[PDB]
Scaffold this active site. Structure first.
Site, PDB file in Angstrom:
ATOM      1  CB  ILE A  72      -1.162  -0.019   1.027  1.00 12.45           C
ATOM      2  CG1 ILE A  72      -0.640  -0.104   2.472  1.00 12.45           C
ATOM      3  CG2 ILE A  72      -2.159  -1.160   0.702  1.00 12.45           C
ATOM      4  CD1 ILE A  72      -1.229   0.838   3.341  1.00 12.45           C
ATOM      5  CB  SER A 131       7.280   3.458   1.567  1.00 10.11           C
ATOM      6  OG  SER A 131       7.480   2.550   0.496  1.00 10.11           O
ATOM      7  CB  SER A 181      10.766   6.625   8.157  1.00 12.51           C
ATOM      8  OG  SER A 181      10.687   5.664   9.199  1.00 12.51           O
ATOM      9  CG  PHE A 182      14.480   3.857   7.901  1.00 10.29           C
ATOM     10  CD1 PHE A 182      15.586   4.170   7.119  1.00 10.29           C
ATOM     11  CD2 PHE A 182      14.150   4.713   8.945  1.00 10.29           C
ATOM     12  CE1 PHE A 182      16.332   5.329   7.365  1.00 10.29           C
ATOM     13  CE2 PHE A 182      14.906   5.864   9.197  1.00 10.29           C
ATOM     14  CZ  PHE A 182      15.974   6.177   8.392  1.00 10.29           C
ATOM     15  N   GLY A 183      11.063   1.227   5.285  1.00 10.13           N
ATOM     16  CA  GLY A 183      10.423  -0.029   4.915  1.00 10.13           C
ATOM     17  C   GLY A 183       9.097   0.119   4.205  1.00 10.13           C
ATOM     18  CG  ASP A 232       9.008  12.955   9.033  1.00  6.64           C
ATOM     19  OD1 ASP A 232       8.850  14.138   8.633  1.00  6.64           O
ATOM     20  OD2 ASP A 232       9.162  11.991   8.261  1.00  6.64           O
TER      21      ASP A 232
HETATM   22  C1  LIG Z   1       3.302   5.085   6.664  1.00  4.52           C
HETATM   23  N1  LIG Z   1       2.534   4.007   7.294  1.00  4.52           N
HETATM   24  C2  LIG Z   1       1.163   3.799   7.180  1.00  4.52           C
HETATM   25  C3  LIG Z   1       0.879   2.660   7.935  1.00  4.52           C
HETATM   26  C4  LIG Z   1      -0.412   2.075   8.187  1.00  4.52           C
HETATM   27  C5  LIG Z   1      -0.645   1.448   9.412  1.00  4.52           C
HETATM   28  C6  LIG Z   1      -1.886   0.853   9.645  1.00  4.52           C
HETATM   29  N2  LIG Z   1      -2.881   0.808   8.733  1.00  4.52           N
HETATM   30  C7  LIG Z   1      -2.655   1.408   7.543  1.00  4.52           C
HETATM   31  C8  LIG Z   1      -1.463   2.091   7.260  1.00  4.52           C
HETATM   32  O1  LIG Z   1      -1.289   2.712   6.053  1.00  4.52           O
HETATM   33  C9  LIG Z   1      -2.146   3.825   5.891  1.00  4.52           C
HETATM   34  C10 LIG Z   1      -3.487   3.396   5.267  1.00  4.52           C
HETATM   35  N3  LIG Z   1      -4.341   2.574   6.128  1.00  4.52           N
HETATM   36  C11 LIG Z   1      -3.753   1.286   6.507  1.00  4.52           C
HETATM   37  C12 LIG Z   1       2.138   2.218   8.458  1.00  4.52           C
HETATM   38  C13 LIG Z   1       2.463   1.044   9.245  1.00  4.52           C
HETATM   39  C14 LIG Z   1       3.374   1.151  10.295  1.00  4.52           C
HETATM   40  C15 LIG Z   1       3.758   0.022  11.005  1.00  4.52           C
HETATM   41  C16 LIG Z   1       3.231  -1.218  10.630  1.00  4.52           C
HETATM   42  F1  LIG Z   1       3.610  -2.313  11.278  1.00  4.52           F
HETATM   43  C17 LIG Z   1       2.307  -1.337   9.587  1.00  4.52           C
HETATM   44  C18 LIG Z   1       1.919  -0.194   8.906  1.00  4.52           C
HETATM   45  N4  LIG Z   1       3.141   3.061   8.064  1.00  4.52           N
END
Ligand SMILES: Cn1cc(-c2ccnc3c2OCCNC3)c(-c2ccc(F)cc2)n1
EC number: 2.7.11.1
Length: 263
Positions: A13, A15, A17-19, A126
């Site tokens: 879906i 990214s 900051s590092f993955g 950030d």
């Molecule tokens: C930039 N980002 C965004 C999500 C995110 C988190 C939860 N749900 C969503 C996320 O993405 C946005 C959109 N809704 C779905 C993460 C994330 C972080 C740690 C993890 F272990 C997994 C994901 N990082």
């Protein structure tokens, strides 16, 4: 693909900051999850460090629940509960315009999220719309703070504080000043230093010119943040009260109905 005996990996879906971020399913609990993948062999491993930050911040309002941490094949795997769209995604979906009521409801929660992270001896570094997500279903009214990849025990050029542009070590005041630019970004639809150097424009734009035509509280907020000393504990209560008094003067009701809830 199968992940840690109970998770099913879905599509990418975006990214962090590092993955890379993926959608996923907890097969055992029957729940959709969010999965962050790192690379086991990465030069600077950080996924387990971030997991420790999330673990330490558990119990705090708007702090996402980390369901599992492990390693699968080529990757380090962090599994988090499913959260909704980012404030950036919601802003774009709302034609890059938020009502004053929405900006204030967001400001109240976002100050509290930053204060909780600071109460846990960390600075975010950030603070940007992409790093705040709304919850889903029953938690749809909740603003969550995400991404601790850049966090430090005590960023993005568009929202960086003047102190950051000067090369000064980031502290509590910097997270709050960044929030001030994010709130003005939500009011204007853009910032005057966007799509331009950014440092020169920020320093040559008086807070009163930036906030012109908008309630004084947005300028007072930024002036307060710019006046804080490096080691200063910010008056979070004062800043929330600033927006809360304006909310009451405007006659708005604290009902969690945001602009996107009206679609
Ligand atoms: C930039 N980002 C965004 C999500 C995110 C988190 C939860 N749900 C969503 C996320 O993405 C946005 C959109 N809704 C779905 C993460 C994330 C972080 C740690 C993890 F272990 C997994 C994901 N990082």
């Amino acid at each position: 693909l199968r992940v840690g005996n109970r998770y099913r990996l879905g599509r990418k879906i975006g990214s962090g900051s590092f993955g890379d971020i993926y959608l996923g399913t907890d097969i055992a609990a029957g729940e959709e999850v969010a999965i962050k993948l790192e690379c086991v062999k990465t030069k600077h491993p950080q996924l387990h460090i971030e997991s420790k930050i999330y673990k330490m911040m558990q119990g705090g309002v708007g702090i996402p629940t980390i369901r599992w941490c492990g390693a699968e094949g080529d990757y380090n795997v962090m599994v988090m509960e499913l959260l909704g769209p980012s404030l950036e995604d919601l802003f774009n979906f709302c034609s890059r315009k938020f009502s004053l009521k929405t900006v204030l409801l967001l400001a109240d929660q976002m100050i509290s999220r930053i204060e909780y992270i600071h109460s846990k001896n960390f600075i975010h570094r950030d603070v940007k719309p992409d790093n705040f997500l709304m919850g889903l279903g029953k938690k749809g009214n909740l603003v969550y703070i995400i991404d601790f990849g850049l966090a430090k025990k005590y960023g993005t050029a568009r929202y960086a504080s003047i102190n950051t542009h000067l090369g000064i070590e980031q502290s509590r005041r910097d997270d709050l000043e960044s929030l001030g630019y994010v709130l003005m970004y939500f009011n204007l639809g853009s910032l005057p230093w966007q799509g331009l150097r950014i440092s020169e424009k920020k320093m040559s734009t008086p807070i009163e010119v930036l906030c012109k035509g908008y309630p004084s509280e947005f300028a007072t907020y930024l002036n307060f943040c710019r006046s804080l000393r490096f080691d200063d504990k910010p008056d979070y209560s004062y800043l929330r009260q600033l927006f809360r008094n304006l909310f009451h003067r405007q006659g708005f009701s604290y009902d969690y109905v945001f602009d996107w809830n009206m679609l």
